[PDB]
Amino acid sequence: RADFIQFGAMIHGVGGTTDGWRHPDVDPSASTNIEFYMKKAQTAEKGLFSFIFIADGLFISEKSIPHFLNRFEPITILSALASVTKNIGLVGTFSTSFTEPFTISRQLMSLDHISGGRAGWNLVTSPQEGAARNHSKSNLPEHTERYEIAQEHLDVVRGLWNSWEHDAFIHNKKTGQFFDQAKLHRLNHKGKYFQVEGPLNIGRSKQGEPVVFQAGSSETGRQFAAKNADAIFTHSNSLEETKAFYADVKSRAADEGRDPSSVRIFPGISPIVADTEEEAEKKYREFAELIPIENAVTYLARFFDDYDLSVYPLDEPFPDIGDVGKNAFQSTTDRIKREAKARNLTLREVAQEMAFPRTLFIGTPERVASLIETWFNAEAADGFIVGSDIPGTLDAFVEKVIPILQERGLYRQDYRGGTLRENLGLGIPQ
Amino acid sequence: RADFIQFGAMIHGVGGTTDGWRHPDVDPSASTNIEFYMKKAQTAEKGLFSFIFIADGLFISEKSIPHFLNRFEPITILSALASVTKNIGLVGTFSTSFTEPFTISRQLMSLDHISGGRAGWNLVTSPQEGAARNHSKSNLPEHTERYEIAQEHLDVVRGLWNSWEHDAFIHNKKTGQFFDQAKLHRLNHKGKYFQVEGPLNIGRSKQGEPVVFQAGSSETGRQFAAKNADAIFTHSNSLEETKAFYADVKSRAADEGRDPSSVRIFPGISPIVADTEEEAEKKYREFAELIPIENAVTYLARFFDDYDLSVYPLDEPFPDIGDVGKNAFQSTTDRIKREAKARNLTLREVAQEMAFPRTLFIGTPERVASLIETWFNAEAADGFIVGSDIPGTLDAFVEKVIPILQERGLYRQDYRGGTLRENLGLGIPQ
Ligand SMILES: Cc1cc2nc3c(=O)[nH]c(=O)nc-3n(C[C@H](O)[C@H](O)[C@H](O)COP(=O)(O)O)c2cc1C
Ligand SMILES: Cc1cc2nc3c(=O)[nH]c(=O)nc-3n(C[C@H](O)[C@H](O)[C@H](O)COP(=O)(O)O)c2cc1C
Ligand SMILES: Cc1cc2nc3c(=O)[nH]c(=O)nc-3n(C)c2cc1C
Ligand SMILES: Cc1cc2nc3c(=O)[nH]c(=O)nc-3n(C)c2cc1C
């Protein structure tokens, strides 16, 4: 592999779980704490990370996780972070389902100008049915139609980004010609879902226009990402699954007539790094133990529930519960029984691990760096998006894993440049 | 008057004119120059200004002024400026015509959290017919209906801001109660124009919720501002007109059952401050002279056009042109003829002044401070929104006028507090 691996940092307030915020080290106000976001962003920039990433959603209930209840909105926090960072990308989730493309186009391009060409857009078709009812709609469109809407939305956004050629603004004080009128282009778009005349009232950025990220995993979504995205998010459930996703999406991109190397695949990992195997495992256990055990056992009960687990002593080995009642959830139950027997887990531990599974990327910096290199060399990844809910795991990753990857020649010593496109290794499409 | 006068700073890139950008001192890239915006914002904060203000529009053509062609978008530039300012308010224009209230509510409240309670919203019903065609509409609603839409939009935005009570987030790690469910409130709004269930996914800010600004001047708009706004923008065409506007809007606010002192009126002025009367006049003339004279004379020709002005020597006195062809534009033409005779203006000078009129607020700091005090004491203003297109006029205002108003006891020595509500003298509505 002639290329270097890249990382993004997902900054996610008090985190992705129901009860992680209860750890002594967590600031339960993190999700609306500007200092927290700034510190995390600057830590990722110290690690030469290609970008930070702000995930988003548009509907909550009393049962939504704490981070989702009360948090920053993405374009605003990214713009605030632009002023206190230098080279790191600024990638935010925005939905195609509700907001007009002119608005999204303008806000992303303005962020691109504020930041000197670091903006990115994680394009999502909102999957949250209730979000429709926050935006004056009775219901969401069906899955397939959501991706039709998204294609038109994206086409308009990119069309509007190209309203002005890169050299349109000649600013000639002597002649009074502020712009070259031949370099201005109206979109004049009249489609099924959007009608947008243009032109956009902001020109090209220092990277041309923002970078597009996408996370589709269905048949439709994978094809949409391969057709449209500069970078693609995916999961890291197993090396084998992630390798297959990578190859499939790269093949789709070729089918769409693109160079597959122009499509950068980033699986998400949440590594737990510590100086010893035992210290990392301790940190995992500290977090896994936070879940109210009754809630975890009840959720565990799902995969069995031919039994009442509240009979069994929590601190005795997981019972030999087992009845093939169809394959109702038997692919999982078999997995659960295996791991419980393999590591002699108690009922309590099984419940805790099901509520908060143990990452593969746990242990010493050398181990975690080696696994990352293995996934990279196996073409499971062009980089990773790194979650850091557990306090200190971003710091530990930057301080201890990055230098190993640098020493091994898999990671740069310095930022490639000042724009997101340059640091991802992409060109500017003007 | 027991209260102090307040100022806002309108930051407007290369400015509000067609040709001001051609002055030697102007940076023609100002409208997308982050440094320019940051410098202006910090200058206003040095002057203890209550807020900065970002105006906006959503439609352009080849004839739009240079600033409108290529500029920052408001929520993004305000959020970026939040990170490099401390106490000064952050007020942006957003339209009720196109964007959904959930989005606007979220973005403003997120800015309010990022900035520690400095956000403000200048609510406008977009008057630009072409903006409709940038947002998948055939045309704008009629004027009256635009204000009906705006009322519902604002009601939903404010409703959503109150999804969470100020003390809802108890963050009790020991019990696991992250929030008090009794302090969460769904909007469940089902109106003519919007249907928005809620709740909003961000809580109360340090000033409760953002401050609402409005600039309505029609019968309908004045009533809407008196009913809804915390602060109102208006013009400064003459002391008499602005006094009448002030009294009218304060009376309307009482009719709506509000305390008129809770409604702060800010006329817009663009002062030209210099150490001598003659130096200030020189600066005005330098800018007035930039307009292509042919364009200015043609525009001047409008108010006459019973003549071809290209006959008359530019540098000879303005002719005694005059025929009461109806009152077609005779209230103005009479004014034009009067001033030309009063100051013995040439054809060229008349054309130049019509293209770029001379502010009343021109001359020494002592004069400009005295005029401001006179307007304040006459109840024409609770403060002023200060434009600064001409390079250095914000600096000159802060450095030379503010200290006089401080010495005279009309202006504070220090910020009152860290929130926009506190510095405007308003309370938080929770
Ligand atoms: C790194 C990563 C980030 C994601 N961010 C979001 C997000 O911000 N908002 C969201 O609704 N879903 C997010 N997802 C979930 C994906 O959107 C979802 O799995 C995918 O869209 C399903 O594919 P489909 O659209 O074809 O159905 C993310 C997934 C990954 C792997
Ligand atoms: C200080 C000030 C700021 C203004 N900012 C904007 C603006 O950002 N966008 C806009 O379209 N109009 C702006 N205007 C123009 C007013 O919106 C317009 O004169 C007013 O809405 C007319 O009243 P009406 O809505 O009742 O018709 C501004 C006016 C003033 C005095
Ligand atoms: C990595 C990942 C992040 C996600 N983030 C959000 C989010 O921020 N808001 C939301 O409503 N849903 C999410 N969802 C559903 C997510 C899903 C995944 C897989
Ligand atoms: C003070 C003032 C500011 C304005 N600003 C804008 C603007 O930024 N964009 C726009 O399209 N129209 C404006 N308009 C029409 C304005 C009008 C006034 C009176």
Burial label for A155, CB within 10 Å (0-12, 13-18, 19+), is middle
Q: What is the residue type of A181?
A: Q
Q: What is the residue type of A214?
A: Q
Alpha helices (H) in A162-276, listed in sequence order: 219-228, 239-255
Whole-number Cα distances in Å, A28 to A33, A291, B110: 9, 16, 17
B188 touches A at CB < 8 Å: no
Alpha-carbon distance of B251 to A304, in angstroms, equals 71
* Tokens coding A283: 């940190």
Maximum distance among all Cα pairs of chain A, rounded to whole angstroms: 88
Q: Which sequence spans correspond to the domains of chain A?
A: 1-430
Alpha-carbon distance of B329 to B309, in angstroms, equals 17
B130 in contact with ligand 4, CB cutoff 6 A = no
Identify any residues that bridge with A51 across adjacent strands, giving them in sequence order: A8, A89
Q: What is the DSSP secondary structure assignment for residue A260, as one 8-state letter?
A: G
Residue A174 · residue B41 · CB < 8 Å? no
Q: Which residue from A102, A110, A133 is facing B77, i.e. has the nearest CB?
A: A110
SS3 track for B260-301: HHHCEEEEEECCEECCCHHHHHHHHHHHHCCCCHHHHHHHHH
Alpha-carbon distance of B366 to B376, in angstroms, equals 15
CB contact under 8 A, B76 and A114: yes
| DSSP helix/strand/coil, B335 | helix
Alpha-carbon distance of B344 to B198, in angstroms, equals 65
Alpha-carbon distance of B256 to B264, in angstroms, equals 15
- Spell out the residues 6+ positions from residue B57 whose beta carbon is closer than 8 angstroms to its own: A201, B68, B126, B128, B131
- CA proximity to B275, closest of B401, B388, B389, B409: B401
Residue A125 · residue A95 · CB < 8 Å? yes
- CA proximity to B93, closest of B64, B113, B73, B67: B73
- Spell out the residues 6+ positions from residue A198 whose beta carbon is closer than 8 angstroms to its own: A159, A160, A163, A185, A186, A187, A188, A189, B134
- CA proximity to B421, closest of B90, B45, B3, B156: B90
Alpha-carbon distance of B260 to B278, in angstroms, equals 41
Neighbours of A276 (CB within 10 A): 10
Tokens 């053509």 correspond to: B61
Alpha-carbon distance of B324 to B321, in angstroms, equals 10
Q: Which ligand is nearest to the CA of B91?
A: 2
Alpha-carbon distance of B365 to A104, in angstroms, equals 44
Q: Are strands B119-124 and A383-386 parallel, antiparallel or unpaired?
A: unpaired
Identify any residues that bridge with A172 across adjacent strands, giving them in sequence order: A177
Q: What angle do CA B393, B397, B400 make, to 5 degrees?
A: 125
Q: Which ligand is nearest to the CA of A130?
A: 3
Residues of A in contact with B181 (CB under 8 A): 62
- CA proximity to B28, closest of B16, B13, B12: B13
A127-156 residues touching B, CB cutoff 8 A: 130, 133-137
Q: What is the DSSP secondary structure assignment for residue A99, as one 8-state letter?
A: S
Instruction: Determine the distance separating the centroid of ligand 4 and the alpha carbon of B297, expressed in angstroms.
Output: 24
Phi, psi of B63 (to 5 degrees): -100, 0
Identify any residues that bridge with A264 across adjacent strands, giving them in sequence order: A231
- Spell out the residues 6+ positions from residue A15 whose beta carbon is closer than 8 angstroms to its own: A21, A26, A30, A67, A389, A390
Q: Is B261 annotated as a binding residue?
A: no
| Nearest atom within ligand 4 for CA of residue B268 | 1
Q: Which is it for the CA torsion B123, B129, B134, B136, positive or negative?
A: positive
- CA proximity to A413, closest of A46, A54, A2: A46
CB contact under 8 A, A292 and B176: yes
A91-110 residues touching B, CB cutoff 8 A: 98-100, 102-103, 106-107, 109-110
A171 touches B at CB < 8 Å: yes
Residue A351 · residue A296 · CB < 8 Å? yes
- CA proximity to A72, closest of B73, B157, B107, B120: B107
- Spell out the residues 6+ positions from residue B324 whose beta carbon is closer than 8 angstroms to its own: B330
Alpha-carbon distance of A108 to B60, in angstroms, equals 19
Q: Name the CATH superfamily housing domain B1-430.
A: Luciferase-like domain (3.20.20.30)
- CA proximity to B71, closest of A85, A169, A167: A169
- Spell out the residues 6+ positions from residue B72 whose beta carbon is closer than 8 angstroms to its own: A110, A113, A114, A202, B13, B31, B32, B37, B54
A173 touches B at CB < 8 Å: yes
Q: Which residue from B62, B68, B171 is facing A181, i.e. has the nearest CB?
A: B62
Neighbours of B78 (CB within 10 A): 32
Whole-number Cα distances in Å, B310 to A193, B60, B354: 52, 31, 16
Tokens 């605030």 correspond to: A80
Alpha-carbon distance of A406 to A410, in angstroms, equals 6
Among A178, A190, A194, A205, the residue to mutate for chain B (most B Cβ within 10 A):
A178
Q: Structure solved using which method?
A: X-ray
Burial label for A339, CB within 10 Å (0-12, 13-18, 19+), is middle
Give me the half-sphere count of Cα atoms (radius 13 Å) on the Cβ side of residue B219. 2
Whole-number Cα distances in Å, B250 to B218, B259, B420: 15, 9, 21
Rg over CA atoms, chain A: 23
Tokens 């002391």 correspond to: B239
| DSSP helix/strand/coil, B205 | strand
- Spell out the residues 6+ positions from residue B204 whose beta carbon is closer than 8 angstroms to its own: B161, B162, B164, B165, B166, B430
Please tell me the residue having the least CA distance from ligand 2 atom 27. B218
Alpha-carbon distance of A120 to A225, in angstroms, equals 15
Alpha-carbon distance of B182 to A382, in angstroms, equals 47
* Tokens coding B165: 């009570």
Q: Which residue from A82, A110, A197 is facing B134, i.e. has the nearest CB?
A: A197
